[PDB]
Design a protein around this ligand. Structure first.
Ligand SMILES: CCc1ccccc1
Ligand SMILES: CCc1ccccc1
Ligand SMILES: CCc1ccccc1
Ligand code: FES
Ligand code: FES
Ligand code: FES
Ligand SMILES: [Fe+3]
Ligand SMILES: [Fe+3]
Ligand SMILES: [Fe+3]
Lengths: 446, 192, 192, 446, 192, 446
């Protein structure tokens, strides 16, 4: 397939070829043009707070070691020995000043340097150039309010610019709330879906909630529960959708601070969020303080998603075109009482974890939609994302980005897939920029 | 067990062994086997309401954890060691049961098929609470659906059971430390 | 079980539960365990003639079904719900046994290896026929052949056993509703 | 591989490259040139008799919904939602006026039309063109005496012409018997063989019966049992072989009406078939009435096979080059007593079903023959089908098609593979026709 | 069993059947079940020293074979039929235990997870040595490690157990003929 | 990938691209340029000593039947029927005068000839040319002191020349000891590693022993046990490394006759080897008699490895780039007492068999090193084998081949990979020779 010419996503992101969910050659091409190029979620400060603390993380199909340095910074390295390529670290988290390879015993520092080689003097003499044998380092590692992302491409925009117009929406909860903590360890489950299936669902799919999650809405007694079985449409002004230049996007459901949490947490949460909102009015204004306590379903392009307020935090780790390893963490606000944090974390896993009853509702939808992308008669068929097209705006006086001023639509699918196609057809960041110089105009046509 | 000598054994595991090596009561092992076999039967036929009514105590904690992989020599990193795949009280189990029975649970059509294999049953009365029964057992749980989806779960269960309404022994705690870190079964949406 | 309340439970499954919750006889459960363990041993070592002679009644119906996947809400489509993978009388089982033992059954060289795991045994005498024993049990059946072929079967078995020649309890009915719709085991050429 | 030039099947169908059973690129090419082009078995009238009745079926690797329309016709559609590609129907059979997608709730009619979209007015307004969003329809659906076949290619010959000379042989049992019923549900088992391995075996392999099925012949006491262990050759005139332009073919074993059925059904069957034959003599002539009660082992190209009289009906559903999902139904004559139909159906499954003891005899043969096609030293080796070559005729006064007047030979392999090669090397039906204008001459050479 | 009639049955297998069909002692079957369940528990928690101390006799032979695939009709080729995956005396088991417990056994970090399922227990005293207990049982052994590595072993075990120090019954022989010829489990580094 | 131009192994074998352990296209290319071209281990005289004795063996991914002929020679044939390609032999060893196919009953002789065809006269008449239908024969089968190797390429050098300078090292144990026997049947286990990972480890990796096998060294109380945890370096003169033109190589550890065997065999072995060494001094000289009782870790290119004295004999049978089927036999000296042979065989399996505790130490090292070769950021990374480079010699007065006069180094990796690259980039043996005309000069540079 010629990725320079092949129209995988139509103009304005209105449709995508179904093969994108099934084609293994395209998956291999995404490793290069999506995963090796873009910002990928690694960890949070709260999981590696002290010098020597480390975790392992996936970046695409690669595995990295992410380590807190003595100077307080974080560096990340390929989990691969520079000698004969054995996996260095076999655990998920810990604290160490270095990592020793179990094959021939080479010792690397937490800073990635090759520090020791068994019997170096007797064997290599002075001929081994250890300075050139440090672990392969992730070129870019940056933080968004404690959330640590990595990028293999030195040419990428800074993480903040990469978030584009999505940053404005995330800031009230990520920054102005006093800060979030990631509660680990994550749940980890393999699903037989393409990573784009859950990524697109979290970025902009409010339409599915009433129908897909009918049973969870009815059974769990949560705040969005009036929607079970499409019994009721969210009223006008119930929310909005947004998307951005580099692909990130989200839905906003006004005031839904208790999110998917069952009735057992609703009063406590609605009290807590409301109290902080009243304080934030004076600091960031009424609109932004309201966004703080509003439910955001967001994907940070390409494969990191979240539900704020619900506190669900997801990584869709790619394995192959029909296989994804799902990592699920909980996010909590630092200044919540510890007992509330504990119950919120359990509730995140109860609803969206390995045995998350809400998440289970999505299984067949994402797996079959992905697997159908391999089927002969469906490869060249068009997946539709045209809902709300012709009603999006850009440059609004209050809400930034390409914005659909309605709770339910496909605005964020369009921006997600516009960025995806621009990356797939580009050889580097400069080409992506050239392919994106009229990004918002393309999204707001008609 | 001396865990200083048996270096791979956890304090928790050594404690659990001790409770079964002491007073062996054959009749109790048999009662426990019946209790668990009947529980598994109700679950296998998806009689989830009957399971709640007949097998689950009002004060239940139903817990399945997933433990982060850490170095055997690790002694400094002290953050949350595990997450809860399940950590349910009775009302939370009821929510899950209602979710299973809801006619708009699309994933349950066509009907799922469950087959449970319960083995290695051990039973011992608690030392301090002579009405608390400790039961250990292992389960293989086979779930088949949608023509060619087959998921097999494997686990050891540490239970406490206690006589409740009508003198019927019911589950007051189940603890499972799930042995596979990354699930290869699509989800863990089964009652172990 | 009220199947109007427990909406996922079939009338058949609710009826089978009822027969075991009533008169529990521990001695009967033990006899049943012995009977099934010895049956499994004979099958595992491929003593198919001994199995027929010692375990199978002359009036046997040996039946394994595969049920078509239908909507949980389905109420109109009323055509054959299942096919019979097995539905054998004694003479038909004998044909299958002769086929296994035939020296020109090329598939049996090199010799197959079978390992059966029988669990969850329950037993209850019939209410109306005090000589009819109902036995329920689950089986994991592992078949290995030809270096790297491995097939694992999982099933619940509803049996009836009755005293026959010499007072020996023999199988007069086995019913299995196979839980996987599309077999991923090359065939179902094993005696569950 | 260049499929225009590559000789995968030699002149006259005398041999085939072993790689055809193992090559995944060729398997992908077959999805296009075999499965998307030719007629494939779907269902029978008897399985969807009433308006609203439906089943799912495979067509190649694609899945379709096959539905009885209000007007009594049958239409078939891809089992894929036109929105974001989720699998619409998750069951195998039922009755419904439509199908609702579990993702976003789009509702399609039994006629494939997009009938409803949740909150269409509020969300899409008048902008959603539902008339253009019907399920992707199978272009061609036709019946052969109740047996329903589908074809994705609008350019295909009518099903009757496609059956070619094979139709004449099938008609006595399929038509003149008063009609057949398909007894469902089918058994379903995955085998590790290429779909062509069982297809070629059913189309023309009488040679294997005495040896492969020695144990089943000896143990089951059936009518063809004298052959166990090649103890005896069928006498001269015991039967014949035929093949046809579009690939379909069969063996004919004279008078074998009880087929593979164990002695417990032999007297009843031989009485029933003989009685109907005596009636049919007056209607269709002695020869054709004899064919009615003669055992036909037939493949309807490409992947539907049957044993008439035995009542075995097979679909070899392709998964990959070494994986096939085998569907097994029973066929019965409508005017048989119901108790006989029931026992015949059980006997079909007893012998050739998931635990079919005859079918099990074939397992290793078909699996290893297929898997060897992947092995390096065997890929370019030649599978032989030359038995009886130079003795076939065409245009016989009594028996139509390319015919070998002997019970055992490879006539039907040759016609099967001649059609296969003509399809693989052609881009469309017109090219197949051009490649087939001397089909019978090629088969009867020397 | 007449192995001339039951042509698929080996002389060894027919002999083993015979020892269990004779004097059935229910109490002995129960003792055996307890013994094997406790042994499996110690192994599952990786208390390998405790296993040696409490379960393994000083005169033990611990043997697992892999049998070469031969023709069912083979009668001429008479070279070594099997190799020993294990064939250990007590000191050799101790070496393996020390290897498991060594802090530089890198493969054991992060800690492995074991779950054993013991079924089909049969027990019979030896005819000639009234202190020798024959125990037969089947095991499913599940080993999980390193996030997504899962290996499942299946086997029948022919044991002899004898009263040793302090009157404790200990394993004096285990024989397993491993049913899969080519292992698909990375290794057989587990105590069956 | 263009294998003519692609530098997979750098000059002097100093590094290799990590992708060589993971790339499936390269694996397919190796089937042609490595496995179909080179000498591969089949069996030993001791396993098929009598006329009619046969075993099955893998040669690459192909399976062969290896049969003792009436004249005492050995011939090998593809285990594939010449009719329709079914696997002929389903067992691992036996004795027969021929092999009959279970599909249509064709009978082949132990000499590969098609001897019988069921009902040939009635079916084929005189038209079947059986003389042209013999099993596909392995072109070359030769013996090295009872060890039988095969080669599909008629153009290969004789086995003895192919062993090159490695033969001199093997001869004291293989020839002058009075001869070895292979004790079967082998253990067989699948590992998730590329075949090159264990092949390179056995050919030249002494460096890993103290660290990888720390626990086995400490627990087993063997003769090389001072090395556990890199507690001690082997003294100067403790051994050497060698490599050869056609890729074979080995490490030599002086005097280590008891090898990996636990202390329970050490005194007996050290006595036996020492006694035979004293006899051999007079026959082959002191140096070569010492080599006899010295531990050799050797790979016979490409995928046959051994540890002499330890008695471990390995075939790394390729399945795919990350899958290898490991066959493990024991070697014993013929004139050892039978009871010692039995215990030695058990000890080989105890240490390096399916439950070999030493072999288990290597699992993660070889599996992760191989699997990392598939990971995006590692494919183009360089595996290092530069230890000892610039200190190797060729043409030494005492020790032949390219030789590193030190116990620990990567000399044998370099020669192994030099031969590998020359084969991968060549279309035939003549091209390999042209690419190898300065092989030792390349290895001894700097
Ligand atoms: C409210 C839960 C949710 C999840 C994904 C997308 C939208 C909404
Ligand atoms: C008579 C059974 C049979 C089957 C396939 C092919 C030919 C014949
Ligand atoms: C001494 C064991 C060994 C094994 C492989 C390589 C070198 C050495
Ligand atoms: S591979 Fe890591 S030290 Fe050699
Ligand atoms: S995918 Fe079917 S309604 Fe959206
Ligand atoms: S395939 Fe071997 S005889 Fe036909
Ligand atoms: Fe959802
Ligand atoms: Fe057949
Ligand atoms: Fe090693």
């Amino acid at each position: 397939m010629n990725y320079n010419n092949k129209i995988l996503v139509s103009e304005s992101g209105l449709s995508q070829k179904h093969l994108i969910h099934g084609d293994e050659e395209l998956f291999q091409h995404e490793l290069k043009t999506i995963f090796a190029r873009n910002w990928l979620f690694l960890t949070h400060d709260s999981l590696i707070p002290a010098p020597g603390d480390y975790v392992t993380a996936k970046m695409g199909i690669d595995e990295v070691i992410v380590s807190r340095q003595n100077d307080g910074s974080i560096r990340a390295f390929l989990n691969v020995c520079r000698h004969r390529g054995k996996t260095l670290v076999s655990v998920e988290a810990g604290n160490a000043k270095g990592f020793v390879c179990s094959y021939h015993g080479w010792g690397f520092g937490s800073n990635g340097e090759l520090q020791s080689v068994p019997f170096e003097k007797d064997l290599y003499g002075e001929s081994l150039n250890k300075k050139c044998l440090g672990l392969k380092e992730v070129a870019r590692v940056e933080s968004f309010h404690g959330f640590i992302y990595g990028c293999f491409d030195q040419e990428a925009p800074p993480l903040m610019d990469y978030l584009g117009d999505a940053a404005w929406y995330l800031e009230p909860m990520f920054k102005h709330s006093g800060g979030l903590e990631l509660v680990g360890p994550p749940g980890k489950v393999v699903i037989k879906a393409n990573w784009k299936a859950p990524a697109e669902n979290f970025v902009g799919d409010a339409y599915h909630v009433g129908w897909t999650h009918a049973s969870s809405l009815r059974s769990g007694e949560s705040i969005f529960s009036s929607l079970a079985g499409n019994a009721a449409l969210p009223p006008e002004g119930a929310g909005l959708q947004m998307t951005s230049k580099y692909g990130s996007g989200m839905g906003v459901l006004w005031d839904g601070y208790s999110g998917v949490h069952s009735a057992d947490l609703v009063p406590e949460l609605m009290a807590f969020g409301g109290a902080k909102q009243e304080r934030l009015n004076k600091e960031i204004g009424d609109v932004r303080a309201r966004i703080y306590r509003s439910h955001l379903n967001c994907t940070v392009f390409p494969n990191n998603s979240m539900l704020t307020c619900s506190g669900v935090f997801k990584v869709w780790n790619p394995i192959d075109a029909n296989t994804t390893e799902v990592w699920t963490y909980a996010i909590v606000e630092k200044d919540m009482p510890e007992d509330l944090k504990r119950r919120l974390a359990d509730s995140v896993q109860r609803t969206f974890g390995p045995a998350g009853f809400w998440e289970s509702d999505d299984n067949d939808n994402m797996e079959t939609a992905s697997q159908n992308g391999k089927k002969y008669q469906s490869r060249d068929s068009d997946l539709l994302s045209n809902l709300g097209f012709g009603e999006d705006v850009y440059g609004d006086a209050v809400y930034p980005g390409v914005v659909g001023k309605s709770a339910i639509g496909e605005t964020s699918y369009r921006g997600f897939y516009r960025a995806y196609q621009a990356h797939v057809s580009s050889s580097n960041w400069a080409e992506f920029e050239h392919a994106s110089s009229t990004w918002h105009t393309e999204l707001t046509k008609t | 067990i001396n865990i200083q000598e048996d270096k791979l054994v956890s304090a928790h595991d050594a404690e659990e062994i001790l409770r079964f090596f002491n007073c062996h009561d054959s009749a109790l092992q048999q009662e426990a086997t019946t209790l668990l076999t009947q529980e598994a039967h109700l679950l296998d036929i998806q009689a989830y309401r009957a399971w709640l009514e007949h097998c689950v105590g009002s004060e239940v904690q139903y817990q399945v954890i997933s433990r982060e992989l850490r170095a055997a020599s690790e002694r400094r990193y002290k953050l949350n060691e595990a997450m809860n795949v399940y950590n349910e009280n009775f009302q939370q189990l009821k929510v899950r049961v209602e979710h299973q029975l809801d006619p708009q649970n699309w994933g349950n059509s066509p009907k799922l098929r469950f087959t449970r294999f319960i083995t290695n049953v051990q039973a011992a009365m608690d030392v301090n609470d002579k009405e608390l029964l400790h039961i250990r057992s292992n389960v293989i749980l086979h779930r088949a659906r949608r023509g060619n989806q087959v998921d097999v779960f494997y686990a050891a269960r540490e239970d406490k059971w206690k006589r409740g309404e009508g003198g019927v022994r019911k589950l007051v705690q189940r603890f499972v430390d799930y042995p596979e870190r990354i699930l290869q079964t699509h989800n863990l949406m089964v009652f172990l």
